[PDB]
Subunit: 372 residues, 4 copies
Amino acid sequence: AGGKVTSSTGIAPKRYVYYPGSEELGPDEIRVIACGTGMPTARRAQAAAAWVVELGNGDKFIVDIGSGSMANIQSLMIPANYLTKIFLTHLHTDHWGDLVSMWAGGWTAGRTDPLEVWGPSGSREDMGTKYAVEHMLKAYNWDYMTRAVTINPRPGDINVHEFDYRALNEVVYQENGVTFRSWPCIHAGDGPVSFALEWNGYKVVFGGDTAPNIWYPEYAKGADLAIHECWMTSDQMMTKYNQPAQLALRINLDFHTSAQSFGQIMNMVQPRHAVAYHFFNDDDTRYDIYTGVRENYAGPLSMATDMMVWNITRDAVTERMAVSPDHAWDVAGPSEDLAPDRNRASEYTQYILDGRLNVDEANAHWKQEFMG
Amino acid sequence: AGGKVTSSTGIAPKRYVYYPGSEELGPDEIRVIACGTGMPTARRAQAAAAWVVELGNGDKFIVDIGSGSMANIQSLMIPANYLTKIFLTHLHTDHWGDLVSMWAGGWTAGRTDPLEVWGPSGSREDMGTKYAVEHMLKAYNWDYMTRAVTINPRPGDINVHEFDYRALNEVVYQENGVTFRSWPCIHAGDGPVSFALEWNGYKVVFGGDTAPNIWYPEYAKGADLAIHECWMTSDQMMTKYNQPAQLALRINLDFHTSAQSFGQIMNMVQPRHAVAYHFFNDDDTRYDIYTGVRENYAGPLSMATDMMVWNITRDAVTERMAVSPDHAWDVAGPSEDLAPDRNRASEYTQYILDGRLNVDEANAHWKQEFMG
Amino acid sequence: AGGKVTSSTGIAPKRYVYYPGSEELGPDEIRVIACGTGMPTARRAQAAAAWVVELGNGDKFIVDIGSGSMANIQSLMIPANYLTKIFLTHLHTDHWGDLVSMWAGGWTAGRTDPLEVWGPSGSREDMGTKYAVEHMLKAYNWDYMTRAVTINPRPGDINVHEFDYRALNEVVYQENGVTFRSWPCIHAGDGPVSFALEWNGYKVVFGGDTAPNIWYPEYAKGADLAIHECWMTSDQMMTKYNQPAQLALRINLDFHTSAQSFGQIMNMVQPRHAVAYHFFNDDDTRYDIYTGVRENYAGPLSMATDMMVWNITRDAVTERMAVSPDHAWDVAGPSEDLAPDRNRASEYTQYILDGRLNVDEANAHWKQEFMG
Amino acid sequence: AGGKVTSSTGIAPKRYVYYPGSEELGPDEIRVIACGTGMPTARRAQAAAAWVVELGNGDKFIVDIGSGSMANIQSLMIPANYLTKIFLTHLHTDHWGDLVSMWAGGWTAGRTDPLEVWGPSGSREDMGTKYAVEHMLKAYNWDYMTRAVTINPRPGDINVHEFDYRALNEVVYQENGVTFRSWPCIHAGDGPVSFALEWNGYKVVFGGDTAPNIWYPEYAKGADLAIHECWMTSDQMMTKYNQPAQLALRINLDFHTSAQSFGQIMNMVQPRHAVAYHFFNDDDTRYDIYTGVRENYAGPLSMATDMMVWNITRDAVTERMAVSPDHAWDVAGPSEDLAPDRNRASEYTQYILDGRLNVDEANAHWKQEFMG
Ligand SMILES: [Zn+2]
Ligand SMILES: [Zn+2]
Ligand SMILES: [Zn+2]
Ligand SMILES: [Zn+2]
Ligand SMILES: [Zn+2]
Ligand SMILES: [Zn+2]
Ligand SMILES: [Zn+2]
Ligand SMILES: [Zn+2]
């Protein structure tokens, strides 16, 4: 498996797994990594929805950042200043839960620009991304104010770009030859959308969560890589969540897209490669779901799980697994100093500061040796 | 290792590893489970700070619920109805970022009561826990309002019991034989605290985070299990983060509790069992840290890592590892069918519901089999 | 998922995963664990062929013991003395490579009786199991003679029971109500067999390796669990091993059991549950293999991987995953240590023993402590 | 951690973890990878002893290849043809058990030269390496003869280079500027040795198994990297193995090198870097072991676990962890395909070949698509 090794001290070429940080991206390539593929129920094996998209022009995007995903994203050895741009298909906790962790973690880890978030309005102010993000920041104001005492705060801001959820395949981002468009989904209530990213001839479709709708088939047409929700079977709804037969049946018809519906939709879309996700990918779930999709779609397919990666070039769409460090550490980028802000009041009172215990004796040993 | 196996078809007794869900609790026993031991920087091997405490009387508590920790908590096979009470030492994202995830995932998973959260206050309203949780609930307002359309809102509420962060060893909860007391910490700004849980003649202390202070050695005195921050060394600060010397030296004296200070602190407390946590536990960091500690403390000592477990009994404090499923699933409890509040208006508009794709034909085949 | 949890302090019942050591086996139940499911090529995710069978009368067998399987087998927390009987289907390294590690490690793990091994003859003496095992013992002469000086050597014998490979469904074992029959396979050269195991109404078939043959369909009919080889596709052969199309094609017609053949065979067998094994079980191989099998067979099917477990009952064959410890240990049994025979030659010379380093000093301190 | 990333589309330099196959080895550099560090008891976390050594001139060696190590070795993505040279410290199963798996597996994976094995003599013929490997090949004669029908048999040979175990730091290998030397150990009986590899001013010492002895401290002196056995504590011996107090005490005195002894030894040796191995490396064992060593040794130290890697250069010896695929595959090297031999009698008799099942019908669908 992999490319043929040509030399003893050389590098293994065309490696059968993706090792994050070890492969150059070419000018006419896209790399998409599934950093979370699962549910609102947590599990170590699948974080919640998150995709990282790296373009050969050097731009990098996050689409969705669900609870748990930060640990996958941080294992990619991408410096935090390259991952400042985040798109949210909707405001379920399992699609934006780890935004806080990107915001706060990315900032101790040396981001120097503000985060930029694109996401959808709702049917009124208090159901859209602008309201959501603004209150999150208040939610974590203790965290914000104490951190800002010691680190310039400009990177701790979040610039939100709220776009109209109702719009039909309209542009919501356009920069440096890259376009994002959105269109709506039908999912729990008004707000959710799907994105399409266009760049240098490629189209990548990030479906989000949805019951089957008429817009995705139209606007995802011809994607190089098309991602869509694909639910666990009604038989698995009974075994796993002990649901009555009637409610089990409805889930795969009213509330969610079934594997059979996914098959029809990808049959319509005709992409170079489809990707089913948002189901628990276990040894006793995955096969029936595959078979349901194959009822109606015959083309290249990926059954998504965490750390799956696609390389999109002219000639091919290649699925591999990424093998990344469990004991991850932040990795530094080329960015430099921002001089801390002198105009920040301490959030300590003298009362607390008087509580300090004397520990000079116990530390004098290591403290002495270290000062060489 | 473990108890002598005596039967061919029986059950291995007193197992060398803890299998969650497999052992009964007994009326004089406490079980403490580290569900996160890490840093604000995320990592598959270490979720951020979380602790689960199950008591002999059937009571359960989460102390801290940092980002990523839910996946570990979920692998315990404890029904969502039994973990409704959560205690926060401080408002840093790595000590309550997964609250939203408990709140949202638990509610979907049939939790029937509201979550209950105790946390400190700050030097003013916008720096304390009641303000944080209030704005957290607004942050996830879309999620709340849409889920509340098909599920009774009562489990979606969160009752916040704020307490004065300045109080010295005062009682903050008192129920069913169980007491918690708080005292202050010295950590980034006013607000952060430690807890001591007292029950049935047991005392268990949760340090949260702090620089060494005079309050912990006093009020933690003779704990069965005492938990305190223990930071990485200054040589490791220079190697892992590329800190210059002066700054690395100070991280361990002014901002954080060094291993040498932790030992001193535990030499004072004289507990049954001491736990160091809040450092990246790796094959190249851990040993120098345990050796800084032993300089000043020689009692029993745990170097915590995720899914480590302590059994408190009269005879001993026993450390084991937990071996849980990575492919976790929610596990049902006793609690009943609490019905939808049918007055709740839908959150869809007709403009969205109007885009449903027709998928009758595609689903006809499996619809028919499942019905018959 | 799993069974309804009924008390805070008690035990979760009918658990969705099998924790080895934590469940009783009932007088009318079979438990089959896959301890290896892989190939002649090694891999942490899949050891080579090995099967553990625990019967409700308290009998235990290993059918095959391929290279790498001991780590999985030793995670079952089964005492070494319960695992003395071993059936080999054939003599490829991936089916008996770990015999020696059972022999040696098991002996130090406690085993007190001889290992006992059943396996087939070949077309001449030097192609059979007696020759094989006897020469393996000579290969490890040094380890055996040196270990025997210190102990009674009885547990280091291996008694081999060779049976004719040509025989059609004849009994090779019959003890305590358990029967085993064998019949032939077509696989590399004369000698490999498949086993049927019968006890208390149940029938479990261990197919081993084989190109498709007339004996399996006949003698495997009506098995509770039928295990058979099921190969990787010809596309995957060209993709992963760079086979030119012609050779890739015949790999699936001449030499191995194709997925479609597997389906045809299990079609004729009509087991309660069929098991496919012996392929690399990766996110990018298993779907085309499953689909191959479903062309021709629609009864219950398992796609094996390591640590899969089947519980067999009158009412059901249930598939679970086992969750067992990676940091496994020797677990002590009832078996009691027997008296040696003061009559074996030492294997040291004095030239060697006169090289001992004087370490008295460096060991004095911890010595002093330990004599408490 | 790691080098600073300089570009969006570029490769992370000096990565904080080692991804096998991804790094060029410099002309004046050695890379040593621990592919097993455990015991004769099997465990997923710790294969039995195995070291892979890669030199900057393109030469590679395996020192020990114990049970279970092959899965780790195979994850390194080195073509079988580059790892034909194997050095055995001694003839315990946990040091050469997986030799049969290198032999068979690498042959079916396009190794085209014979394996070359160096190992010690014993006090008489039947306690040496030559005898041992001769009988290992006979033990697996069914596998050997059936394979040589279809694959050229040359690479199925093992040339054994036996050397005198008694020799005191004498060359046993010399080639292309690379020297291995051996000296005796005291372990179980006469035969075991330790090795030193010398090349290009570097010295790496592979301890093997031994009670403390006068030879290692003298001949390992000034090693760039030195490896020695470091046994579990006597207390851990009573907890984990239930050894009575006196038995547990002599184990660390007469039979093994205690951690305190390790430390004295390394204090004499003064290696640029020391490495302890051959203990179960667990959260509840490692710490006291490390404390043991530091009683007497203060220099750089690693506590070996599986997939740890050392880079040795002129400036530094760096420890890192290797992160490699669990789902491993053979990778092909540059070599010339070896044509078989037709003068090889089949190992099939017609009696078995007459048993083939016809499967043209079940296979006709996929057959047709695949041929076009
Ligand atoms: Zn959603
Ligand atoms: Zn979702
Ligand atoms: Zn904090
Ligand atoms: Zn913290
Ligand atoms: Zn075979
Ligand atoms: Zn095989
Ligand atoms: Zn040995
Ligand atoms: Zn050994």
